[PDB]
Structures are given as structure tokens and as C-alpha cells.
Amino acid sequence: PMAQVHQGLMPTAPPEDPAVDLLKNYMQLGKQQREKQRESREKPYKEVTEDLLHLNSLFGGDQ
């Protein structure tokens, strides 16, 4: 083996396999999609608190 076997044959196992990175790519777009769908328009964290400041001035509590 070694010399007259296997040698001279191209590796059928791709070391550049993009599927390994695709794991984090998919995890990435998993959150990216989430944070881009409703998070951009709605934004249930910052817009709620910001609007709450508006709401405080909205009911016009002064006296």
C-alpha cells in the first residue's frame, strides 16, 4: 500500500467543506432574521421604553 495505492488519487474528502461554517452562518441568520423581521420595525424593548417616556408626557400629569 501507500506508494502504489491511494497515492495519485485526489482526496474525496473536502477539507474546504463550507457546511461546517454554514452551522454558524445559519445560527447567524437565525438571529439576524429574527432581529430584522419584527425587531427592526416593532422593537419590543427600546420602542416600548421610549414610548413610555412619551406616554408619561401624554397623560399630561402636572397638577
Angle at 47 between CA 44 and CA 52, to 5 degrees: 110
Give the up-direction half-sphere exposure of residue 22: CA atoms within 13 A in the CB hemisphere: 5
In degrees and rounded to multiples of 5, residue 10 shows phi and psi of: -65, 140
Return the CA Rg of the chain. 28
Q: What angle do CA 48, 39, 23 make, to 5 degrees?
A: 145
Closest C-alpha to 34, from 49, 45, 48: 45
Q: From 5, 19, 46, 3, select the one nearest 54 (Cα to Cα).
A: 46
Show the 3-state SS of the chain.
CCCCCCCCCCCCCCCCCCHHHHHHHHHHHHHHHHHHHCCCCCCCCHHHHHHHHHHHHHCCCCC
How many other C-beta atoms can be found within 10 angstroms of the C-beta atom of residue 25? Answer: 13
Solved using: NMR
